[PDB]
Symmetry: C3
Subunit: 145 residues, 3 copies
């Protein structure tokens, strides 16, 4: 009982009941997605990826290898994640940096999350923020304009 | 006399003459789009949405419920809008916050527009800006780097 | 010997051996793309565009007319480029501003590159940065948070 749009390319069988995956999403085979998620249009979800239950991923987000999203997380549109702190074309690290977005946290629209980051339970990341350090549980963080 | 790309999912009949809607766009049924718009690839346009005439929406933009775009507006690529100031997964507000981008205004590439915002007529929003307060008509606003 | 995903719209024949172009990409006819590039999902590549060899373009990037990418460049996800410094809807300039990203340079996730910019060889642009001035060769530049 999950809904995969005919215009998505979903290669993972590991998708929970109630989850919706919308148009022009790519989901690679090893991705794990929980129950009652909403994966909005134009998202990319790689292999070494775990996403919990009741997660909302708005449009235009990519979830790279090494990223874990816990239950009840909200990820705003065009939010960007990283798994490589010093990227150079065709220079593959032995191991990708890991990011974890902990239960109930929310990431505002168009925020940028550096590699290796923990965002604590129920944190709120302001729209457009750059997150270069871990954010503590329940903290509201935004970049000064 | 409007052009919907075969690789778009356009569900709205409310689309003006001369409008182009490009590959991998999603446009939901209640969306209103005026004449001679250009809705570039990879855009998402929701239901409670009004877009005027001669509007340019570059690639990778989402126009959420509660957002109105007036005539002659330019929206740069990967510009992000918001309709929920304190987003939590599966916590639906009674009413979405409204944003209006007034006639002739321009929003630079990758800008972030907070919910509830008015951008005045002929304003210019710098590339990458975070807009947390209304922008007055004809004002050039950008976030200090 | 190049791989074009069946869910991409690639109109250019000017694509080097070993290049991969993934789902939901648009590549217009005059685009030039070198050998062993990886053009990830959800990218847009216009006509007056030259991209060298061994270039990585992560998801959700648009490469506009007037932009040149040299060999061995890395472009992070949701990176945004510009070819028009004072955009107004339907006001087409005689000439688009040119941007060049020089050999081996890397642009972090969700960075914004203003029009007319040179990013020098082997530079590193931090995630989320706004680049309003040329970046010198081998320099690490990021926007203060
Ligand atoms: C971070 C946020 C929760 C803060 O809301 P708040 O605590 O009510 O803060 P206020 O609106 O009272 O603003 C306090 C100050 O911080 C600034 N500020 C607020 N959000 C900001 C942001 N995202 N980036 C930068 N500055 C921000 C305001 O400009 C204000 O500055 P001032 O004191 O100089 O006037 C909210 O503004 C936000 O970014 N929400 C996320 C929206 C979103 O992305 N939704 C998902 C898509 S719908
Ligand atoms: C905002 C904008 C219109 C200002 O242009 P301008 O008034 O000619 O300003 P200048 O280039 O003279 O720059 C003035 C100062 O503001 C800074 N600045 C300009 N644009 C900025 C931006 N978007 N964000 C942050 N700082 C910016 C410059 O770095 C310069 O700083 P300095 O005085 O310390 O050297 C322009 O830079 C811009 O962002 N244009 C939008 C481009 C775009 O997104 N096009 C759509 C896609 S093609
Ligand atoms: C720019 C970058 C290379 C700098 O790494 P570094 O030189 O190791 O810098 P550090 O982590 O030691 O940070 C130095 C300081 O700059 C700040 N900083 C680092 N990167 C920043 C960024 N992108 N934006 C703003 N501030 C940043 C840190 O917060 C720190 O501030 P502090 O001294 O006040 O504590 C790196 O942080 C980065 O942005 N990498 C790109 C990641 C990416 O986009 N990958 C592609 C997708 S996988
Ligand atoms: C019909 C349809 C829907 N969608 C996605 C995008 C659309 O905004 C979303 C609607 O589902 P929802 O469950 O009503 O909304 P969601 O939980 O994703 O987000 C909404 O509610 C939260 C609470 C707000 O913060 C958010 N800003 C809202 O968009 O599903 C698509 O991507 N394609 C579609 O065709
Ligand atoms: C052929 C084709 C076009 N498009 C979109 C994306 C492409 O950049 C645009 C070209 O149409 P246009 O009317 O020539 O250009 P637009 O008005 O969108 O923007 C151009 O002009 C304005 C004035 C500049 O600020 C802007 N930076 C330019 O891109 O249409 C697509 O999305 N897919 C396509 O296949
Ligand atoms: C199978 C498949 C792959 N891709 C794209 C997106 C995916 O992340 C990438 C994998 O190819 P790669 O050559 O393994 O990785 P890439 O060089 O693009 O990037 C990886 O390595 C560099 C060194 C890191 O900085 C980067 N963060 C990594 O993603 O190819 C797609 O877009 N669709 C797909 O179906």
């Amino acid at each position: 009982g999950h809904m995969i749009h005919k215009l998505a390319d979903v290669q993972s069988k590991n998708i929970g009941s109630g989850t919706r995956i919308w148009q022009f999403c790519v989901v690679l085979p090893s991705a794990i997605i929980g129950e009652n998620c909403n994966i909005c249009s134009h998202c990319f979800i790689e292999n070494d990826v775990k996403i919990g239950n009741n997660v909302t991923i708005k449009c235009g987000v990519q979830i790279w290898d090494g990223i874990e999203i816990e239950d009840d997380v909200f990820i705003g549109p065009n939010v960007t994640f990283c798994n490589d702190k010093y990227p150079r074309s065709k220079q593959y690290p032995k191991e990708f940096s890991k990011t974890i977005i902990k239960k109930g946290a929310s990431i505002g629209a168009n925020a940028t999350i550096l590699p290796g980051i923990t965002i604590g339970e129920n944190a709120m990341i302001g729209a457009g923020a750059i997150v270069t350090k871990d954010v503590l549980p329940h903290v509201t963080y935004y970049s000064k304009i």
